[PDB]
Design a protein around this ligand. Structure first.
Ligand SMILES: Cc1ccc(NC(=O)Nc2cc([C@H]3C[C@H]3C(=O)O)ccc2N(CC(C)C)C2CCCCC2)cc1
Length: 372
């Protein structure tokens, strides 16, 4: 399922340099701030040779190439970020990008798995995974707080990895009827989820709201229900008609969904808009991680097991997990207020109110699953 013990859904030790064959791509991606500002970004993209993807032969080089092409694509479409957009992606980016995206089974737009899960390095390999020892590989504009937003997102993923590695213990304990082992597992998950909540606080240290809202959000925006590209984007030379794809959001994280699925909280049940969105966002996750979520829904229910045993210790450990999720969602809502709602007050579903209502629906659905 391509889940790492240490960093979870994050790509371990991402690749940083492509083969020299792709130098022309890497130069543009590494210089987005200068090229966007000077107005050379679009000219440089339009001057690119067509580069075959046949020199990208392992998962790490393909993932780096997707991140490179994805950042180039956002810079090309959105430009300087003030409404002068391009609705046609030139063939010499669109064709290799779409081919690579098909091989990796991801849509041809920058997604969370590119610009967070694969967009990072350790400064010192001998030091731990702390903010001070980490950097991103690509940013869009000087002052866009991309390092802070991407790395804090990644730090939440790494924190969650401590809980994700316990999930097999949970199902093995239910299968083997190991009550004490299951109780310890559920409590360990809840403890890790509250430590993940502590990581959330780091966003205030590294991301300021004006920069995030007015700059970074622009470059992460997509072309699904977006009035600036109402029919989607033309991937020139690959598909004739434009296609719509959503921009990035926290709902693309597998961490956002996997614990609800583990605990039997049915966030994708029904035809409601929140459910449909979370189902649709699975298409924006790496296929192995989609598969992991699907396997969790097919396993015997943790929730029915705990409810069937007349075990107040099991129910409370389960409830500790649920409350931890509820806290996480509530802090998530505070982030929406500080980083979106308030900056806005001075694309369909992108509106801060729609984002707010979505998280409130999710948090309510989580609260409903409390046993007592
Ligand atoms: C392409 C792309 C897509 C997404 C992202 N990373 C992002 O969105 N992180 C995020 C955003 C919001 C706010 C805007 C509203 C939302 O999108 O729901 C709240 C919380 C978070 N996390 C932890 C934070 C403390 C940084 C998320 C919360 C769920 C688990 C992962 C981290 C980066 C690039």
């Amino acid at each position: 399922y391509h889940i790492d013990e240490e960093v979870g859904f994050a790509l371990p030790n991402p690749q940083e340099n492509l083969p020299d064959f792709y130098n022309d791509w890497m130069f543009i991606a590494k210089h987005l701030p200068d090229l966007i500002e000077s107005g050379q970004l679009r000219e440089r993209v339009e001057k690119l040779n067509m580069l075959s993807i046949d020199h990208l032969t392992d998962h790490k080089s393909q993932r780096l190439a997707r991140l490179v092409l994805g950042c180039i694509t956002m810079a090309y479409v959105w430009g300087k970020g003030h409404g002068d957009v391009r609705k046609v992606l030139p063939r010499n980016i669109a064709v290799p990008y779409c081919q690579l995206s098909a091989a990796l089974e991801l849509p041809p737009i920058l997604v969370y798995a590119d610009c967070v899960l694969a967009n990072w390095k350790k400064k010192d390999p001998n030091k731990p995974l702390t903010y001070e020892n980490m950097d991103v590989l690509f940013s869009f504009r000087d002052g866009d707080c991309s390092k802070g937003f991407f790395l804090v997102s990644l730090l939440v993923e790494i924190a969650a990895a401590s809980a994700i590695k316990v999930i097999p213990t949970v199902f093995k304990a239910m299968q083997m009827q190991e009550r004490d082992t299951l109780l310890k597992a559920l409590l360990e998950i809840a403890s890790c989820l509250e430590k993940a909540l502590q990581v959330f606080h780091q966003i205030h240290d590294h991301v300021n709201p004006k920069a995030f809202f007015s700059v970074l959000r622009i470059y992460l925006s997509g072309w699904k229900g977006n009035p600036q590209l109402s029919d989607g984007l033309v991937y020139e030379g690959f598909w004739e008609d434009p296609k719509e794809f959503a921009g990035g959001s926290a709902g693309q994280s597998s961490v956002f969904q996997c614990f609800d699925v583990l605990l039997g909280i049915q966030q994708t049940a029904g035809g409601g808009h929140a459910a449909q969105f979370l189902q649709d966002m699975r298409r924006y996750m790496p296929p192995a991680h989609r598969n992991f979520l699907c396997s969790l829904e097919s396993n015997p229910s943790v929730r029915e097991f705990v409810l069937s045993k007349g075990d107040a210790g099991l129910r409370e450990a389960y409830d500790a997990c649920v409350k931890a999720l509820v806290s996480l969602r509530s802090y998530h809502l505070q982030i929406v207020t500080k980083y979106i709602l308030i900056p806005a007050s001075q694309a369909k579903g992108t509106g801060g109110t729609d984002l707010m209502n979505f998280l409130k629906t999710v948090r309510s659905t989580t609260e409903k699953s409390l046993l007592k």
